[PDB]
Symmetry: C2
Subunit: 209 residues, 2 copies
């Protein structure tokens, strides 16, 4: 009972593009509507010929889709990146269900980290959550910091490290509020736009994959 939007993308994996792969996974998730948001004709000519719906509209594209297709501000929206074609549809359904069952707002996904290099890789985003699973913070720094383990060791990690995956959930009308809100300074230092949501007081629920 949700809609999935893919902001895209061109690669050959067994005679099929990559965006159509993402489209098939979104189909298998069981979404009522699937829309591919793009401003390029290359993505269109592929998805349209693949039977996928396209909307012609920097993550604000989905916001336009909320009003280009005139979606109710209670509908559940799932943003899958166009460059994750091997994503299982089970976690795509998860993100929607976790948003619907939480206090609503915005939702995202995390996986456990088990490689120390990953834990100390700034390109790998870590997230810390409260007891209810709501995101306390996103960061490129190694959080939560393990004082005893990391006191002098950069090769041993515990079980408290989570990597944030760029699949998101929304309640439609709040995507308009994302674009409406001014760019925070925190999202510019960390280069993580989702921190804006935490800057402005709204909370994010996190699903463990």
């Amino acid at each position: 009972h949700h809609m999935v939007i893919i902001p895209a993308p061109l690669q050959d994996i067994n005679g099929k593009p990559m965006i159509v792969h993402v489209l098939e996974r979104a189909r298998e998730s069981g979404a009522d509507r699937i829309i591919v948001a793009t401003d390029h004709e290359d993505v269109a000519r592929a998805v349209e010929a693949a039977g996928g719906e396209v909307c012609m509209t920097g993550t604000e594209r989905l916001a336009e889709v909320v009003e280009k297709c005139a979606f109710s501000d209670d509908t559940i929206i799932v943003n899958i990146q166009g460059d994750e074609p091997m994503i299982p549809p089970a976690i795509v359904r998860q993100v929607a269900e976790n948003l619907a069952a939480s206090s609503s707002g915005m939702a995202t996904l995390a996986v456990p980290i088990h490689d120390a290099e990953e834990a100390f890789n700034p390109n790998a985003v870590k997230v810390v959550m409260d007891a209810k699973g709501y995101a306390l913070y996103f960061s490129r720094a190694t959080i939560p910091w393990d004082r005893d383990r990391f006191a002098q060791s950069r090769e041993t990690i515990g079980d408290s490290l989570l990597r944030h995956i760029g699949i998101y959930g929304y309640r439609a009308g709040f995507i308009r509020r994302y674009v409406s809100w001014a760019p925070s300074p925190l999202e510019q230092i960390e280069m993580l736009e989702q921190l804006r949501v935490l800057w402005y007081g709204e909370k994010i629920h996190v699903a463990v994959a």
Copy 2:
């Protein structure tokens, strides 16, 4: 319109018996009591399990509570307050704590339920020192997170070098504000795996969903006296 409790930290390996040591004709805890007086508090209670500290504070006129946020709990039990009284935690080894920031934590608590202070970090070594605790907060000053990692992470600057620092790093300073029912709630909560990982007990409050307000200190306070060098320094400065 607030009350101040001073944990007189007798226990210390480098200066055993900290609150009793003479600073220019007055013991340290008496000086901390005078700072609390300059803050503008309606009641000042020194919490201590030592009789010499009690007889030193009582000879100066401060209220004394015998105990044993563990210790502080018994104070809010022994003088059981209303859960509206703003409460300021001042360390007993800080005889030069600016009373302005002591008033400030209560003022910023007045507008939540738990409040604390931070000071800007200006040197790279402190920003990457896990012993220095960094705090990141939201639009209205409420702490998003406390950590021993360098947060917020400055991706573009730190990608080149960890040698220079921007303007976004704040060190949390262990002066806390409470609404006096907040403490009764805290003392009941079980330890939270997050504070065990980070060795940061304030992460209990954020783990159980309750908020913390953080204020940039109007004046940067002085480190609490823990060694004879700081004793002589405060003697020369007071």
